[PDB]
Ligand binder design. Structure first.
Ligand SMILES: CCCCCCCCCCCCCCCCCC(=O)OC[C@H](COP(=O)([O-])OCC(O)COP(=O)([O-])OC[C@@H](COC(=O)CCCCCCCCCCCCCCCCC)OC(=O)CCCCCCCCCCCCCCCCC)OC(=O)CCCCCCCCCCCCCCCCC
Ligand SMILES: CCCCCCCCCCCCCCCCCC(=O)OC[C@H](COP(=O)([O-])OCC(O)COP(=O)([O-])OC[C@@H](COC(=O)CCCCCCCCCCCCCCCCC)OC(=O)CCCCCCCCCCCCCCCCC)OC(=O)CCCCCCCCCCCCCCCCC
Ligand SMILES: CC(C)=CCC/C(C)=C/CC/C(C)=C\CC/C(C)=C/CC/C(C)=C/CC/C(C)=C/CC/C(C)=C/CC/C(C)=C/CC/C(C)=C/CC1=C(C)C(=O)c2ccccc2C1=O
Ligand SMILES: CCCCCCCCCCCCCCCC(=O)O[C@H](COC(=O)CCCCCCC[C@@H](C)CCCCCCCCC)COP(=O)(O)O[C@H]1[C@H](O)[C@H](O)[C@@H](O)[C@@H](O)[C@@H]1O
Ligand code: HEC
Ligand code: HEC
Ligand SMILES: CCCCCCCCCCCCCCCC(=O)OC[C@H](C)OC(=O)CCCCCCCC[C@@H](C)CCCCCCCC
Ligand SMILES: CCCCCCCCCCCCCCCC(=O)OC[C@H](C)OC(=O)CCCCCCCC[C@@H](C)CCCCCCCC
Ligand SMILES: CCCCCCCCCCCCCC(=O)O[C@H](COC(=O)CCCCCCCCCCC)COP(=O)(O)O
Ligand SMILES: CCCCCCCCCCCCCC(=O)O[C@H](COC(=O)CCCCCCCCCCC)COP(=O)(O)O
Ligand SMILES: CCCCCCCCCCCCCCCC(=O)O
Ligand SMILES: CCCCCCCCCCCCCCCC(=O)O
Ligand SMILES: CCCCCCCCCCCCC
Ligand code: FES
Ligand SMILES: [Ca+2]
Ligand SMILES: [Cu+2]
Ligand SMILES: [Cu+2]
Ligand SMILES: [Mg+2]
Lengths: 54, 153, 54, 153, 325, 21, 63, 54, 54, 232, 108, 49, 54
């Protein structure tokens, strides 16, 4: 029965559900994928930052 | 005929017989006997049921005396489009038509239980002669083969 | 068996079903003239029409 | 889908001539019961009595009655447990041999041939020391020597 | 040496009390291992809970804490010590593991009775191969193998018509099987009962007619796969026990997927007195035409399995939960 | 819709036997 | 808190119904149906608990 | 579907499917098969149109 | 290089004997497939019959 | 023989006892009674690799044999001791006839006069369930009549002597020895004779000739047209 | 799809006796359940978080072999459809577990 | 399709399921349902604009 | 516990094993997979999933 809320959540929030207006909506994301738009461009990157750590 | 067997039989009248105790290797009956085998509605399948199965048979009204103990004879011509229904299943006791897949129940007076056929297989009355031979005791009650406009009273 | 199927299809027609069968086959199936009507329709009648239409 | 609770393999039967009685919770079983009648007017009964009674009690068979007259048994010993009493006409019993491994007893039978019809069904009745088993059994000719039997014609 | 009473009962988690010294050793090991596992689990879960109740977002707001605290990433020495600790734990555990597993896998227990177990699809068949002269019919060491019944199997090795594909032997070489005089055969409607003595070293010889099965006795706390041609597979087909301490009837199940009626091939062990067993053997030896149930009745036992019942074979029955015979 | 004359009947059992001794 | 307690009570009564219903239908096919009943009851109870534990520590605000 | 079901005896035997199942596939498939075919084909045609415009 | 219509395997036409499948040619299969998937829908009027083939 | 039964029951006491019983009386929903089936029914079921059944379904399958020839005959001997029915057909010596049951008038090859008669017999009774040339056919619900290529002549004889599952039983009174031998002649002649003209597309008929052309034949000609013409 | 099978298994085990399933169709129900969740769910979910995030996490425009990457998805789907076709046969799917223990899983 | 010669209901349960799915689909197609935009803010997400 | 043969004698091919690899499979491939879905959903789709439903 868990499948029921899960499926409804995925289906509903795919079309509706809050728009993300920020690059990194979870706040303190610390990996390169949180340096792009949501969703990312076709080629994943409109720019690259300076990578100095993990 | 052993129990759970099927055999095609044809209307062999008394005067077209050459076999048996009175056989002369001079009489020619082959040409006549070919007429019966080549008749459009002549073929009849004779089934010997197991004694356990013969007690589960439901007969049609008016055709209750048409069997000889364990022998039931049904017309071989399908009641859909007249293909020969000859795929007799020994255990399921269904007769399957090769052409279009109709299953006629052998324990329900040939009533179809699948496919496009709507009417049950006609049954032939049979009995045994004084000499000891299987004979037809009567004619079919109803027209054989596929339906037509002016068929069923 | 194809001819048996075809003949029994025609014979089962609502009104003109048994009268049509006797007109095509020249009687009950099978009949003497049946394979002669089929042969002439096959070597001449249809190919003439076909060639003309083509 | 065809491997459900009702399958077309589990429900199959012995595919021989003549039925049986008793399945699971019955002390005595009879298997493959017919009234054999040789072409040249020699009669008898074929059956096989299995004593599978959990409470070892050693059933013995008193008599067999086909329709009206009894059958000549051959003073068979009582069936103890997981044993078997195979009976047939003597002519068809010389073809097989008594094992020394299990406990199987071969017995010959005979009748008076009152007038049984091939293909007919008759109410065979076994009377043991304790109980009687009544079953309808077909009348059939014994199996032919396989591969030697041509046509007279 | 189980820890205490009710606590010890809890630690078992339904582990049967065990009727064998082997089972006792395994049970003790299991209880202690669970004691340690529970401790470790409690610590790990305790930390997971304190992560909820202690380290929070607006838990750390009353104290004027801001965001981004400590930001530590490498406590080197703690990492090395928290690597070593699991190593020590697993090593000390493995010592006891190898210590315990030696008891069961030993084959030097000097058995006083050997049983030939033969698993087939789908039932069991037991035969008394050797019996010590002590508890023997007359006194001479019982020698249960059939002269001609076994030699007939030994002759199945080569197909008379050319068929020796498997290393110059018949594809259906049933010769690894052992045929005996006193054999209990299990039917679909009669559960095979293997009768054993008490306080005696028993040996079991396992083989399979066709497919892989598994001789599991929950009370033994032990199971072993029986394989067709166990020698070729290089599987030890023999296991021994010191003795059986308890008396009564114990279930046994096939714990290996083997076709359809896998859930329906159960056997029973009837452990009886020494003298009684001897008498049983004497009766069944002098009465080769008798049945196992009759022999069991001879020694005052229940003729049929008490811990198990045969399954009703009818498929479209049992819908109402009546699956026993 | 249903076949007008195809109708099951009520019946139980019968017996037979040959002649000429 | 509003939706919660209602869901808990509805779930509880359904679950009780299911538990009671199992006892009549012994080992039949209907035992499966009664299992579905109690599963639905338990599901509703946990749904109520989940909504209760969300309005306590919410992560999403109504705009 | 008409062609396959006209010859579902040879399909049943060679491909190990129930003949009754084949009959029912033919019966039901003549309603559900065309509908799915239309949906997929329409969407794919518009997809091909879109790729042209890009 | 390929066999078609091996008529020697089949015998002379006999109304009483038949084979498994026994399909017409590929172009005629749709008509034969129509007959298989049509249910038993006979109309029994007063002393008349419309076959299920109609 | 006695040792035959002895060793013949030994194989049966570890293989055929689950879904058959101890006294071959059968089980509720596992298998029938083997009483009266005969020495010829055990041969067909065991040798052809049809027995033992591994799972209940629409129809039991032919597979790899579990037992050899000798073992099969031992099991058959044990079974026939519980009331015997049809037996194996032998020849001049005590050997199982194989190539001798390829026609009534068989000497060293099939007589063309035997295939003619055997053909019409085969067509009358078994052309329906099987194909014209025994290629196989479908049945009611997951069942089918198998292709006849895999069976030897003894298996053919015993197949129509006993009636395996849904096959009817053809006793010697119904189809005589000569008729059965003629049927075998036709079966073994149509199998072992290559097509006079072409690559017989599994002998299935109009359905296989229409797939070779309508799917593969036209594709080659399209490829030729695509080669000569343009893509614009 | 794999869960629908676990529930059917789990429903049958509710009470003693075979209520709606048989041995044959219970055995082929955990074989297919345990398979479609290691090889049709588990592994096919490993390469989805891998195919999405890995190029995004290393700063790549695309994967090395994009056209081969598209083949890995389609072959998995075909394999999944192939293994489930067993249920559309009268006998049923495979009924030997997810491990093909021998000689249980041979011609014989 | 439910009217004819067939004794089995494994095909009835197959017909009714498909019919139910078709009816559900046609009702969705008729009473075209729409949903609202979820006007929420999760964690460090910014409002539209 | 399963890794020690003295303990695995009683536990092999039982429901203790079944319980074990459902804590590890349903552990990793279900809990962490769903975690990954909720985590990366904004990245994959530019929308956020409902917290209450989650
Ligand atoms: C043993 C020997 C048997 C092998 C037989 C090999 C067949 C060769 C066919 C010619 C290939 C044509 C071609 O250019 O390649 C097409 C194609 C790709 O070329 P393309 O430039 O992309 O074509 C698109 C253009 O429009 C360019 O095409 P186009 O529009 O300009 O027209 C050119 C025309 C040219 O074609 C024609 O001229 C048509 C003639 C038909 C007349 C009918 C008479 C019969 O081709 C077409 O119209 C469409 C392609 C036709 C070929 C389709 C492939 C059929 C072969 C079956 C697949 C592989 C089977 C081999 C298996 C190995 C056996 C050992 O290559 C293939 O796939 C052919 C198969 C490659 C076989 C190599 C591997 C086998 C080697 C065995 C070693 C051991
Ligand atoms: C067991 C089967 C498991 C197979 C697993 C899947 C194969 C993965 C292929 C790894 C190769 C990596 C690669 O560079 O991909 C290139 C390419 C991907 O193109 P892309 O993603 O757009 O970009 C790649 C490069 O940037 C642009 O590529 P490129 O055009 O500059 O040149 C790349 C290509 C250029 O080379 C060619 O043009 C090679 C010609 C085609 C080979 C014909 C093979 C048949 O060279 C290769 O693909 C590497 C070596 C080629 C020969 C060895 C490949 C395997 C041969 C067969 C394996 C064994 C089959 C046993 C038979 C089983 C019976 C069914 O992949 C292929 O061309 C496919 C070739 C292999 C297909 C084998 C599948 C057979 C499945 C049978 C199952 C039953
Ligand atoms: C208006 C508009 C533009 C569109 C609307 C379309 C519309 C509703 C049109 C009206 C349709 C209508 C009333 C059609 C007339 C129907 C009638 C009464 C047709 C009878 C015609 C007739 C003589 C048919 C012969 C029967 C046939 C074609 C049987 C098929 C058939 C044949 C012919 C074989 O030879 C055969 C051989 C071997 C196996 C199988 C077959 C087989 O099935
Ligand atoms: C080009 C791609 C082609 C893909 C097509 C794939 C779809 C095929 C689905 C196959 C389902 C088959 C399930 C089998 C079911 C079965 O065998 O049941 C039979 C009755 O068949 C039925 O009704 C099922 C018919 C319903 C099928 C619906 C098919 C519609 C398709 C076209 C649409 C869906 C897929 C769309 C894919 C399109 C791709 C694009 C996305 C009756 O049983 P029976 O032969 O009587 O035997 C038993 C005794 O043996 C035994 O005693 C027992 O006791 C008896 O009860 C009896 O069962
Ligand atoms: C489920 C396990 C099963 C096992 C194991 C089994 N059988 Fe059977 N047997 C059947 C079933 C079911 C049938 C029903 C007919 C069929 O499907 O062929 C059958 C039918 C037969 C027949 C056909 C009898 C007839 O005319 O109806 C013979 C002979 C036979 N079995 C012999 C054997 C022999 C010899 C073995 C030797 C191991 C064996 N069986 C093992 C289940 C089994
Ligand atoms: C259904 C009607 C039916 C008829 C009529 C029929 N068979 Fe069969 N036949 C079957 C079925 C079904 C089987 C499979 C039974 C089994 O293998 O358990 C079969 C099996 C066989 C086998 C074993 C096949 C093999 O590959 O080993 C042979 C040989 C055989 N038939 C030949 C014949 C011969 C010869 C005739 C007639 C002169 C005949 N059959 C008539 C249905 C039929
Ligand atoms: C390609 C997609 C095709 C899906 C084939 C799924 C059938 C797999 C084999 C299962 C089987 O063996 O059936 C026979 C069985 C004994 O009886 C029953 O299952 C009772 C009937 C209840 C089944 C509802 C049908 C669902 C309809 C689906 C099309 C809806 C998908 C959403
Ligand atoms: C509108 C709606 C069509 C729905 C069906 C209704 C079938 C209900 C069957 C009930 C029954 O059994 O009564 C017996 C009686 C005897 O049955 C009939 O009279 C019905 C015969 C009609 C068949 C035409 C089929 C032609 C198909 C074409 C329309 C397809 C072309 C594309
Ligand atoms: C964080 C780890 C916490 C450690 C808790 C230790 C609790 C186990 C007590 C051991 C009692 C030994 C009794 C005995 O002789 O039984 C024997 C050995 O028992 C064990 O297997 C204990 C293994 C415990 C796991 C190892 C963790 C050790 C951590 C290192 C710190 C010392 C078995 O009895 P038996 O041979 O059957 O007669
Ligand atoms: C437009 C139609 C397209 C089809 C999409 C397919 C998805 C269908 C799934 C339907 C799910 C319903 C949505 C829903 O209710 O979720 C939400 C409520 O939450 C739940 O469903 C939780 C309960 C689930 C488990 C307990 C079940 C107990 C009842 C027993 C049932 C047998 C709907 O509320 P919402 O407006 O989304 O916030
Ligand atoms: C598509 C998968 C369906 C799962 C249910 C299968 C159970 C029926 C078994 C068959 O036989
Ligand atoms: C949908 C049409 C149903 C037609 C039924 C007509 C019945 C006529 C009388 C009978 O026969
Ligand atoms: C007789 C042909 C009429 C065509 C009707 C088209 C209906 C197909 C729609 C199914 C797909 C849903 C969008
Ligand atoms: S002709 Fe017999 S069903 Fe069509
Ligand atoms: Ca249950
Ligand atoms: Cu087992
Ligand atoms: Cu097992
Ligand atoms: Mg294991």
């Amino acid at each position: 029965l868990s499948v029921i809320p899960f499926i409804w959540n995925v289906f509903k929030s795919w079309r509706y559900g809050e728009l993300v207006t920020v690059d990194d909506p979870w706040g303190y994301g610390n990996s390169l994928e949180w340096a792009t738009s949501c969703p990312p461009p076709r080629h994943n990157f409109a720019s690259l930052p300076r990578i100095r750590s993990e | 005929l052993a129990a759970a067997s099927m055999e095609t039989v044809f209307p062999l009248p008394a005067e077209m017989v050459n076999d048996g105790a009175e056989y002369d290797p001079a009489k020619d009956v082959y040409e006549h006997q070919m007429h019966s085998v080549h008749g459009p509605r002549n073929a009849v399948m004779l089934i010997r049921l197991r004694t356990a199965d013969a007690e589960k048979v439901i007969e049609r009204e008016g055709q209750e005396s048409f069997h000889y103990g364990d022998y039931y004879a049904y017309s071989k011509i399908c009641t859909h489009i007249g293909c020969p229904t000859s795929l007799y299943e020994a255990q399921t006791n269904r007769i399957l038509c090769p052409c279009h897949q109709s299953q006629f129940d052998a324990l329900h007076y040939g009533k179809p239980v699948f496919g496009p056929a709507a009417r049950a297989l006609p049954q032939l009355p049979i009995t045994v002669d004084e000499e000891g031979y299987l004979i037809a005791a009567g004619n079919f009650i109803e027209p054989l083969g596929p339906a037509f406009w002016e068929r069923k009273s | 068996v194809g001819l048996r199927i075809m003949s029994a299809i025609i014979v089962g027609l609502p009104i003109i079903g048994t009268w049509m069968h006797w007109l095509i086959f020249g009687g009950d199936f099978p009949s003497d003239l049946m394979l002669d009507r089929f042969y002439i329709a096959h070597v001449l009648i249809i190919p003439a029409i076909l060639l003309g239409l083509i | 889908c065809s491997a459900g609770q009702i399958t077309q393999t589990s429900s199959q039967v012995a595919a021989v001539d003549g039925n049986q009685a008793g399945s699971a919770n019955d002390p005595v079983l009879v298997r493959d019961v017919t009234v054999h009648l040789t072409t040249d007017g020699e009669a008898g009964v074929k059956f096989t009595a299995i004593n599978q009674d959990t409470s070892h009690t050693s059933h013995t068979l008193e008599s067999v009655t086909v329709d009206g007259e009894e059958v000549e048994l051959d003073d068979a010993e009582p069936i103890e447990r997981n044993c078997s009493l195979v009976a047939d006409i003597q002519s068809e019993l010389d073809l097989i041999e008594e094992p020394e491994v299990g406990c199987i007893q071969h017995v010959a039978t005979s009748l008076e041939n009152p007038g049984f019809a091939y293909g007919g069904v008759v109410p065979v009745e076994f009377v043991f020391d304790t109980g009687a088993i009544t079953i309808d059994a077909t009348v059939s000719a014994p199996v032919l020597e396989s591969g030697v039997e041509n046509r007279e014609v | 040496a189980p820890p205490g009473g009710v606590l010890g009962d809890f630690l078992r988690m339904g582990w049967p009390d065990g009727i064998t010294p082997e089972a006792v050793a395994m049970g003790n090991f299991w209880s202690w291992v669970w004691v340690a596992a529970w401790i470790i689990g409690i610590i790990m879960w305790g930390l997971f809970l304190t992560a909820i109740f202690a380290w929070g977002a607006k838990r750390a707001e009353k104290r004027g804490e801001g965001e981004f605290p400590k930001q530590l990433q490498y406590n080197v020495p703690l990492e090395l010590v928290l690597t070593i600790v699991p190593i020590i734990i697993v090593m000390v555990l493995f010592f006891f593991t190898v210590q315990t597993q030696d008891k069961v896998t030993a084959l030097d227990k000097n058995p006083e009775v050997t049983v030939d177990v033969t698993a087939y699809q789908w039932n069991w068949k037991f035969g008394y191969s050797e019996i010590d002269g002590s508890l023997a019919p007359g006194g001479q060491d019982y020698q249960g193998s059939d002269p001609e019944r076994q030699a007939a199997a030994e002759a199945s090795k080569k197909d008379p018509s050319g068929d020796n594909p498997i290393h110059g032997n018949s594809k259906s070489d049933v010769s690894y099987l052992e045929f005996n005089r006193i054999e209990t055969l299990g039917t679909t409607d009669e559960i095979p009962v293997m009768v054993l003595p008490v306080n005696t070293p028993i040996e079991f010889n396992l083989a399979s007619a066709d497919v892989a099965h598994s001789f599991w006795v929950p009370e033994f706390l032990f199971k072993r796969d029986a394989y067709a041609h166990p020698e070729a597979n290089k599987s030890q087909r023999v296991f021994q026990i010191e003795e059986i301490t308890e008396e009564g009837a114990f279930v046994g199940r096939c714990a290996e997927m083997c076709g359809t009626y896998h859930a329906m091939m159960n056997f029973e062990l009837r452990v009886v007195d020494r003298d009684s067993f001897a008498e049983y053997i004497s009766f069944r030896d002098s009465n080769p035409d008798a049945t196992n149930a009759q022999a069991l009745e001879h020694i005052g036992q229940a003729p049929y399995a008490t811990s198990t019942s045969p399954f009703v074979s009818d498929r479209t029955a049992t819908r109402d939960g009546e699956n026993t015979q | 819709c249903x076949x007008x004359x195809x109708x099951x009947x009520x019946x139980x059992x019968x017996x037979x036997x040959x002649x000429x001794x | 808190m509003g939706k919660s307690f209602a869901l808990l009570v509805l779930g509880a009564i359904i679950l009780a119904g299911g538990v009671w219903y199992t006892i009549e239908v012994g080992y039949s096919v209907m035992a499966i149906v009664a299992a579905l009943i109690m599963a639905a009851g338990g599901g509703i109870i946990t749904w109520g608990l989940a909504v209760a534990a969300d309005v306590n520590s919410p992560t999403s605000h109504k705009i | 579907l008409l062609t396959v079901s006209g010859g579902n005896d040879v399909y049943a035997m060679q491909f190990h499917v129930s003949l009754n199942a084949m009959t029912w596939i033919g019966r039901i498939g003549l309603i559900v098969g065309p509908a799915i075919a239309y949906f997929i084909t329409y969407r794919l045609c518009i997809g091909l149109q879109r790729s042209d415009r890009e | 290089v390929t066999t078609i219509n091996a008529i020697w395997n089949l015998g002379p036409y006999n109304p009483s004997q038949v084979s498994a499948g026994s399909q017409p040619d590929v172009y005629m299969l749709w008509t034969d497939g129509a007959a298989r998937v049509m249910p038993a829908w006979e109309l029994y009027l007063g002393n008349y019959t419309i076959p299920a083939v109609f | 023989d006695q040792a035959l039964i002895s060793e013949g029951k030994d194989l049966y006491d570890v293989a055929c006892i689950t879904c058959h019983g101890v006294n071959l009386q059968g089980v509720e929903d596992r298998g029938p009674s083997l009483v009266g089936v005969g020495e010829g029914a055990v041969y067909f079921q065991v040798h052809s690799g049809r027995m033992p059944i591994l799972r209940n379904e629409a129809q039991a399958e032919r597979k790899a044999p579990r037992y050899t020839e000798a073992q099969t005959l031992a099991i058959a001997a044990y079974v026939a001791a519980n009331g015997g029915g049809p037996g194996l057909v032998y020849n001049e010596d005590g050997t199982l006839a194989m190539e001798e049951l390829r026609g009534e008038n068989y000497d060293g090859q099939i007589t063309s006069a035997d295939v003619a008669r055997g053909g019409d017999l085969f067509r009358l009774n078994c052309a329906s369930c099987h194909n014209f040339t025994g290629r196989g056919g479908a049945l009611s619900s997951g069942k089918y009549a198998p292709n006849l290529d895999a069976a030897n002549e003894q298996e053919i004889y015993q197949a129509m002597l006993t009636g395996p599952q849904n096959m009817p039983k053809f006793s010697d009174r119904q189809l005589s020895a000569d008729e059965k031998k003629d049927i075998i002649a036709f079966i073994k002649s149509t199998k072992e004779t290559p097509s006079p003209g072409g690559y017989s597309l599994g002998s299935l008929g109009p359905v296989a000739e229409g797939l070779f052309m309508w799917v593969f034949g036209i594709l080659v000609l399209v490829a030729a047209a695509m080669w000569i013409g343009s893509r614009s | 799809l794999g869960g629908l099978m676990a529930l059917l298994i789990r429903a049958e085990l509710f009470t003693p006796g075979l209520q709606f399933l048989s041995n044959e169709q219970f055995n082929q129900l955990f074989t297919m359940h345990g398979t479609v969740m290691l090889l049709l769910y588990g592994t096919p979910i490993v390469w989805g978080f891998a195919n999405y995030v890995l190029p995004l996490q290393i700063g790549a425009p695309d994967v090395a072999f994009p056209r081969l990457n598209a083949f890995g998805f389609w072959i998995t789907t075909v394999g999944g459809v192939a293994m489930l076709t067993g249920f559309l046969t009268p006998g049923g799917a495979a009924d030997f577990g997810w491990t093909m223990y021998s000689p249980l899983s041979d011609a014989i | 399709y439910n009217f004819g010669n067939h004794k089995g209901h494994v095909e009835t349960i197959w017909l009714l399921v498909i019919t139910a799915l078709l009816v559900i689909g046609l009702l969705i197609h008729l009473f075209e349902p729409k949903l609202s935009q979820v006007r929420t803010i999760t964690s460090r997400n910014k409002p539209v604009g | 516990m399963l890794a020690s043969p003295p303990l695995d004698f009683h536990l092999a091919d039982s429901y203790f094993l079944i319980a074990h690899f459902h804590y590890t499979l349903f552990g990793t491939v279900v809990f962490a997979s769903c975690a990954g879905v909720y985590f990366w959903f904004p990245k994959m789709t530019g929308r956020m999933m409902d917290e209450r439903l989650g």
